[PDB]
Amino acid sequence: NEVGYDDIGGCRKQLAQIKEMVELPLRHPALFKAIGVKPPRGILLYGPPGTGKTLIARAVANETGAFFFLINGPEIMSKLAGESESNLRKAFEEAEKNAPAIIFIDELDAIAPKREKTHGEVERRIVSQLLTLMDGLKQRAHVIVMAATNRPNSIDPALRRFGRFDREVDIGIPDATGRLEILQIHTKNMKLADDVDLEQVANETHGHVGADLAALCSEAALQAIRKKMDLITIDAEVMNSLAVTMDDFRWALSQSNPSALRETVVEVPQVTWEDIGGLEDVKRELQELVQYPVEHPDKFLKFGMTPSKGVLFYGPPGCGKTLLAKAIANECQANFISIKGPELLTMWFGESEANVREIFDKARQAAPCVLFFDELDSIAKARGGNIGDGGGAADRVINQILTEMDGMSTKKNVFIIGATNRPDIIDPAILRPGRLDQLIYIPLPDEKSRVAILKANLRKSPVAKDVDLEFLAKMTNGFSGADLTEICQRACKLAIRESIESEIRRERERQTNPSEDDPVPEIRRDHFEEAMRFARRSVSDNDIRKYEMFAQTLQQSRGFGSFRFP
Amino acid sequence: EVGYDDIGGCRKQLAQIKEMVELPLRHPALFKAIGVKPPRGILLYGPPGTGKTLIARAVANETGAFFFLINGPEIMSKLAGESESNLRKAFEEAEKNAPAIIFIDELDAIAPKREKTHGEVERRIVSQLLTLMDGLKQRAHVIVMAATNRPNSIDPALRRFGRFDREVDIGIPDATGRLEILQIHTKNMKLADDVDLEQVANETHGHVGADLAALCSEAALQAIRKKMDLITIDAEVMNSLAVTMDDFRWALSQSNPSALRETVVEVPQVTWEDIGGLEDVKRELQELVQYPVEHPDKFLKFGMTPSKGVLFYGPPGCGKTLLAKAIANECQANFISIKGPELLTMWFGESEANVREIFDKARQAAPCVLFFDELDSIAKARGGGDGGGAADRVINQILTEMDGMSTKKNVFIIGATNRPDIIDPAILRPGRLDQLIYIPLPDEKSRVAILKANLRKSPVAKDVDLEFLAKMTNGFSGADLTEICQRACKLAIRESIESEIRRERERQTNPSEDDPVPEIRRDHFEEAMRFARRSVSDNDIRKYEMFAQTLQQSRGFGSFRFP
Amino acid sequence: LDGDRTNSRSTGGKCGCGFKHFWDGKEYDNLPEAFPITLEWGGRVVRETVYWFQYESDSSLNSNVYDVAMKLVTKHFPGEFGSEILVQKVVHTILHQT
Numbered sequence A: 001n002e003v004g005y006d007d008i009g010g011c012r013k014q015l016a017q018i019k020e021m022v023e024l025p026l027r028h029p030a031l032f033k034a035i036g037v038k039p040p041r042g043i044l045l046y047g048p049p050g051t052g053k054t055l056i057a058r059a060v061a062n063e064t065g066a067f068f069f070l071i072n073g074p075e076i077m078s079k080l081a082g083e084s085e086s087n088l089r090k091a092f093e094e095a096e097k098n099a100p101a102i103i104f105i106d107e108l109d110a111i112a113p114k115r116e117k118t119h120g121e122v123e124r125r126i127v128s129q130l131l132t133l134m135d136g137l138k139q140r141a142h143v144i145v146m147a148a149t150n151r152p153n154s155i156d157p158a159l160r161r162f163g164r165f166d167r168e169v170d171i172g173i174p175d176a177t178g179r180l181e182i183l184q185i186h187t188k189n190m191k192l193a194d195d196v197d198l199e200q201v202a203n204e205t206h207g208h209v210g211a212d213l214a215a216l217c218s219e220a221a222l223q224a225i226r227k228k229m230d231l232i233t234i235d236a237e238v239m240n241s242l243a244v245t246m247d248d249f250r251w252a253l254s255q256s257n258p259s260a261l262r263e264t265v266v267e268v269p270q271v272t273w274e275d276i277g278g279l280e281d282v283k284r285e286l287q288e289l290v291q292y293p294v295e296h297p298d299k300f301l302k303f304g305m306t307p308s309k310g311v312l313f314y315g316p317p318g319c320g321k322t323l324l325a326k327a328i329a330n331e332c333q334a335n336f337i338s339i340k341g342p343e344l345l346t347m348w349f350g351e352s353e354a355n356v357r358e359i360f361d362k363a364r365q366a367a368p369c370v371l372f373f374d375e376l377d378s379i380a381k382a383r384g385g386n387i388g389d390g391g392g393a394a395d396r397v398i399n400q401i402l403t404e405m406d407g408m409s410t411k412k413n414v415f416i417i418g419a420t421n422r423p424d425i426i427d428p429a430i431l432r433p434g435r436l437d438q439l440i441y442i443p444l445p446d447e448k449s450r451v452a453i454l455k456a457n458l459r460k461s462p463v464a465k466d467v468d469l470e471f472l473a474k475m476t477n478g479f480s481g482a483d484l485t486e487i488c489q490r491a492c493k494l495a496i497r498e499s500i501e502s503e504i505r506r507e508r509e510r511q512t513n514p515s516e517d518d519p520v521p522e523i524r525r526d527h528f529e530e531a532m533r534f535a536r537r538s539v540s541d542n543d544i545r546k547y548e549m550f551a552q553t554l555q556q557s558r559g560f561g562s563f564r565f566p
Numbered sequence B: 001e002v003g004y005d006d007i008g009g010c011r012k013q014l015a016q017i018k019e020m021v022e023l024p025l026r027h028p029a030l031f032k033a034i035g036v037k038p039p040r041g042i043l044l045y046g047p048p049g050t051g052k053t054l055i056a057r058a059v060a061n062e063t064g065a066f067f068f069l070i071n072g073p074e075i076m077s078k079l080a081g082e083s084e085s086n087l088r089k090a091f092e093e094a095e096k097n098a099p100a101i102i103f104i105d106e107l108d109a110i111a112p113k114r115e116k117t118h119g120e121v122e123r124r125i126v127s128q129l130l131t132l133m134d135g136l137k138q139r140a141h142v143i144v145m146a147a148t149n150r151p152n153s154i155d156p157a158l159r160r161f162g163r164f165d166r167e168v169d170i171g172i173p174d175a176t177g178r179l180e181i182l183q184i185h186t187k188n189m190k191l192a193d194d195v196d197l198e199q200v201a202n203e204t205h206g207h208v209g210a211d212l213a214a215l216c217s218e219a220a221l222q223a224i225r226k227k228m229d230l231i232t233i234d235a236e237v238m239n240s241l242a243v244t245m246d247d248f249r250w251a252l253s254q255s256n257p258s259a260l261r262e263t264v265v266e267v268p269q270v271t272w273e274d275i276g277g278l279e280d281v282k283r284e285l286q287e288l289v290q291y292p293v294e295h296p297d298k299f300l301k302f303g304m305t306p307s308k309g310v311l312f313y314g315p316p317g318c319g320k321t322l323l324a325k326a327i328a329n330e331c332q333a334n335f336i337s338i339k340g341p342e343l344l345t346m347w348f349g350e351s352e353a354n355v356r357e358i359f360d361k362a363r364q365a366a367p368c369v370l371f372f373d374e375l376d377s378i379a380k381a382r383g384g385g386d387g388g389g390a391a392d393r394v395i396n397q398i399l400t401e402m403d404g405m406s407t408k409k410n411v412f413i414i415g416a417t418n419r420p421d422i423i424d425p426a427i428l429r430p431g432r433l434d435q436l437i438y439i440p441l442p443d444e445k446s447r448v449a450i451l452k453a454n455l456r457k458s459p460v461a462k463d464v465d466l467e468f469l470a471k472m473t474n475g476f477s478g479a480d481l482t483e484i485c486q487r488a489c490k491l492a493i494r495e496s497i498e499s500e501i502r503r504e505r506e507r508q509t510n511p512s513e514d515d516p517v518p519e520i521r522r523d524h525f526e527e528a529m530r531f532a533r534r535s536v537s538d539n540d541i542r543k544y545e546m547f548a549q550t551l552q553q554s555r556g557f558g559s560f561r562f563p
Numbered sequence C: 001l002d003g004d005r006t007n008s009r010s011t012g013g014k015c016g017c018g019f020k021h022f023w024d025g026k027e028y029d030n031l032p033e034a035f036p037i038t039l040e041w042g043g044r045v046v047r048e049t050v051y052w053f054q055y056e057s058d059s060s061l062n063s064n065v066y067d068v069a070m071k072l073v074t075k076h077f078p079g080e081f082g083s084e085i086l087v088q089k090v091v092h093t094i095l096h097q098t
Helices: A015-028 A031-036 A053-064 A071-077 A082-099 A121-134 A174-188 A198-204 A210-229 A236-241 A246-254 A280-290 A297-303 A323-331 A342-351 A355-365 A396-407 A447-460 A469-475 A480-511 A525-530 A542-559 B011-021 B027-031 B050-060 B072-077 B084-098 B121-136 B176-186 B197-203 B208-226 B245-253 B279-294 B296-302 B320-328 B342-347 B352-364 B375-381 B395-403 B444-454 B466-471 B480-507 B522-531 B538-553 C066-074 C085-097
Strands: A040-045 A067-072 A101-106 A143-149 A165-170 A310-315 A336-338 A369-373 A415-420 A438-441 B041-046 B066-071 B100-105 B142-148 B166-169 B308-312 B334-338 B368-372 B410-419 B435-438 C003-009 C019-023 C027-030 C035-040 C045-050
Touching: A015 A031, A015 A040, A015 A053, A015 A143, A015 A165, A015 B121, A040 A053, A053 A101, A053 A143, A067 A071, A067 A082, A071 B121, A082 A121, A082 A143, A121 B121, A165 A355, A174 A198, A174 A210, A174 B395, A198 A246, A210 A236, A210 A246, A210 B208, A236 B197, A246 B444, A280 A310, A280 A323, A310 A323, A323 A336, A323 A369, A336 A355, A336 B466, A342 B395, A355 A369, A355 A396, A355 A415, A415 B208, A438 A542, A447 A469, A447 A480, A469 A525, A480 A525, A480 B279, A480 B296, A525 B410, B011 B041, B011 B166, B041 B050, B050 B066, B050 B100, B050 B142, B050 B435, B066 B072, B066 B084, B072 B084, B084 B100, B084 B121, B084 B142, B166 B352, B176 B197, B176 B208, B197 B245, B208 B245, B279 B296, B279 B435, B308 B320, B320 B334, B320 B368, B320 B410, B334 B352, B342 B352, B342 B375, B342 B395, B352 B368, B352 B395, B375 B395, B435 C035, B444 B466, B444 B480, B480 B522, B538 C066, C003 C019, C003 C027, C035 C066, C035 C085, C045 C066
Parallel strands: A040 A143, A040 A165, A067 A101, A101 A143, A310 A415, A310 A438, A336 A369, A369 A415, B041 B142, B041 B166, B066 B100, B100 B142, B308 B410, B308 B435, B334 B368, B368 B410
Antiparallel strands: C019 C027, C035 C045
């Protein structure tokens, strides 16, 4: 019943942040009292539900040894009016009594939702009482208050003030490493065959949270029980010998229904420069833009330079703009946030451009970061653009993006990267200094880049040694990344179909002659030769010339040069 | 008491609930000792009248678990405070007894969408329910079930980990389910050999269990009315009553079902036989649907990502829905159809947010083949066009949901359109409907198969030669052949009817028998094709064949030979 | 040369001559039913005639609206941005003319 840091899994950076925030003031009250420092009063943790936030608070309180208290919002609101106030006051008084103490208010938004949302007088009364109690913390002794909420705007804005729940931690969603941590923690009390590799399961289970992974483990265990227990009446020996296998985990993952599939995921991408070879100049430019101002700030301070806020990509579709953005994010170990074009189109259609504020807020909260806008031309393209209607190039969502970029302090090290297949119809108001100000052309991959792409695509496939990706890349000139990925997928499909047909034929052979090895253990190169028959060039020389014309037109004005000091 | 034999039309869902709440109840010791946790709340939802409470009662009784019932309207009827008292008492009784099962009928009445709860007492009662729900752990083996029309009806606070987390979409019963229900509801009724409940089940489309009970009651009532005056003189003479097929047909006529406006989710009865030919398209559909479900191990071994969906483009009435249903039937996967009027309604009403419901329902029934009958409906409605771009609202939400889908759920999207050009190019990118399959006009063999399938219910003289009809009907589409077949039956009906009136003339003029026309005849089909016209012109097939050829000819990078 | 007797007879025929007609460095069964189309793109008016081809035994040399339209757009408006809309317009016009 007493939890510790070991049990807490999924979140490590956030746990360290909370530790540095809370443990030191609690474990050394004299230090903060002696020093002229303001200890934290209210810490607001938000994230999707089921991430073990209450467990995090319990673990922190136990490890720090501070008295812990829990307040469930629905429980408080269940009481009759007047009794809810008594419960809240009693909770805070008890927390004060056993100072140092930590008060956790689970489901805070249920207590103090959006101000307009509350209708009756009792809701406003209890919210005001909570606010009054929060500001009466200085007279107390090291009584930190922690609260859980889905989103920062999901509570009454009055709470997010100084002396109130000002400090923030974003538990968010566990990443692959965090997911593996959670899976290892939950499977601590189960028998698992050597066949299973929890690392692979953690990799596969994208979009899940801690509760979802716990449900998956329970489902796998019960699937094993059903497969084996049904054979028995009941025998305890079977349960003792019960051991789940990777088939059970895969089937359970089939019936998963994760609750965080639609959330926004921020995490250092696993993509690396090797995944897309070539483009050394673009690599250097992205380095100078994103790495130097985080690995060498003193240089910028000494020489008095202002780091560029962001950059804009532009080139043929499916050439690896997202690949390059993710690679540069990986290089600096900075979180990567992608905003696909459909999100911008949804904001435009719903006239809900105000959501652009939340995107930049989330990017700031996870600094350093690389905010990626996959298609800035989507909204403009939706109106024609090249000719379009009689309106100008300005719109709602792009205007909000411009506002947020202008209101972004460069000291936070958040770099905006934009991508577009139609650079012309991009709003000229976003290409000025102080905004996206450098244009990087992402050409079609050359021979070496194509070899690297082909090698990266097949990294997860069983490929025979007889293949020669060098020759295949040499033959395919002008193919984009999408085309090469399509070629690899077609070869894989041919291999799978051949394997299945051979297996069925072998089954029939056994049926007729019921008296082995895999007929196609790996992708033979004849599959690739057959697959190449279905290859296509998504981009055309017309598009290539269009982009080269755009680049040359940008280049014309640079004629000033050959300067010479006397 | 009520048992599993009393449940019909929910065999799949009932089996799911059995697998869910049998082991936790009949073997508490296994759960207690083992660290695994059982479900703490199950949310059954579906259209009202499917007997969800009966399902809960059967599950509780057959497993011996104590059963408790709470009526939402009953609880809300109580005064302020008494509702909370009654809920607490009910949960206390459930805890006290043996492993219990609490069924809260009409949950949304207690805790509907917050926006529908403006008074304070509603919030108080919802908070009470939530507080009781998360406290179930202190209780031992106390599962809680609830009934609701749809997931978006109750306060989303309840649908949360710890609280209601598991769900069971009961949905409408299917033809087999309707037959099972009818067999249940006719148990105590005396019915003559003429009635076949198979026909009733196959005809009462859009009915639920309550509707079928009403139908049987109405049929019995008409039987009584027909044999009323004879038995008001006597009472016990009614023992010799046998409801006839006429009674059931009349009851069906005066039906007024309640589920006519739902989305039927079931394995289609269509098969590749109904639409012959297109072997290559059959192979492609098999590869893209059956293989990822019938052989996941191959995909895991070769590290391949199953395609998310495919697109059909071709002339109107060439049998795209037929192919989608056939593939959905081969793999025994459910089939959900979203006709063009649905997309147009979402566009006009600015209710594109309803697209999430469609995909949630499709995922809930995995493996499933979500078929969008007309993706170009919205594009055409704008002209095909106004001054804007191809992007719009409904298609944008479709793109969002498709991108936000998990490939492991086996849901396979399919789209159809008569204009492959005006379709939004943003939907054909990789990771979306990246496969375009041309559905040409049916060939001779497929025409023969279509004709045979169309006339699979009508009485057709063997003298007819469907092969000849297909041979002389080149260029026709599925709709045209169906029209030809329907016309032939109509002429037979017209010929048949006038013969009865001729018999009446014989009775009148000469009052002092065999079927005139027993089956459709050579002559009818000869006159029926008097009104046969090719719906799609030779000028129109040009566009589809030409797009297909244009796509194919781009495959110039062939003959690539390794060293 | 264009519209003249060649060294290969026309299987399609339907000319009276019966001989294939040379075109664009290739041998074809018959002559075009050429028709005029006006190509306008972002304030640029151009007049051109498309030499439509049909009745080809090979079935591959027959005119293709998609290929013809893309070729015309590239030839007259090369490297233009968003030319897909112009291609759609031209292909629609050619289809409706026939």
